[PDB]
Amino acid sequence: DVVMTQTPLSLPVSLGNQASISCRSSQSLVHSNGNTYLHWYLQKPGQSPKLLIYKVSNRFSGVPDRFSGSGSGTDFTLKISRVEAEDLGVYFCSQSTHVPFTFGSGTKLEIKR
């Protein structure tokens, strides 16, 4: 299966800071249709993962422009500008180019003072 890894596991920042998450795949995520099916989810405590960014860079319904996704091939990045309390949670990247679909281990975005 395609292995997805995220750096870091825990990402302490200050409110108002930029945070950036790295997501790497063990295999190219470029599908035969030429598109790249790398997605990001955000999960809050006790809730389900919610789709945040899809196909590298597309914002899902209601997702602010402070979130930007980039990257290609096997190497991807989620950038969260001007971190707010509503952004805190665990971010997962995930690939659906290859079957079975697989998930990164997650990155906890948290505030440290």
Partner: protein
């Protein structure tokens, strides 16, 4: 609105059995490929099972770790999908989500709330 809701989770004894259900609405269920994904405390988020639509023989697919113990099934008239778990192991502890392939996104874009399965 796409809606999914899991039920049936709970505390169960190793070797025991448990059936999860998923009630859905808001998309064309007849076309949908439906799935169970779990968030296990050992592996994290991992796909468990898939069942294809009627036009693909309702064919079933499983993760190697549950193959032979779990059965995924669907009721198209009810628009529900199920996961019968047998011979449950400590490994199987986790939050179980139903999701699948429907609406405008051919991946797991919409999940239920999840149901907690605890193997004691």
């Amino acid at each position: 609105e796409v809606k999914l809701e899991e039920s049936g989770g709970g505390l169960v004894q190793p070797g025991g059995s448990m059936k999860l259900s998923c009630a859905t609405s808001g998309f064309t269920f007849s076309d949908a490929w439906m799935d169970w994904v779990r968030q296990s405390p050992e592996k994290g988020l991992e796909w468990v099972a898939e069942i294809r639509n009627k036009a693909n023989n309702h064919a079933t697919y499983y993760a190697e770790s549950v193959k032979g113990r779990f059965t995924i099934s669907r009721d198209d008239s009810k628009r529900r999908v199920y996961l019968q778990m047998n011979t449950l192991r400590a490994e199987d502890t986790g939050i179980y989500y139903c999701t699948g392939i429907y609406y405008h996104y051919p991946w797991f874009a919409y999940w239920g709330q999840g149901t907690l399965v605890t193997v004691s």
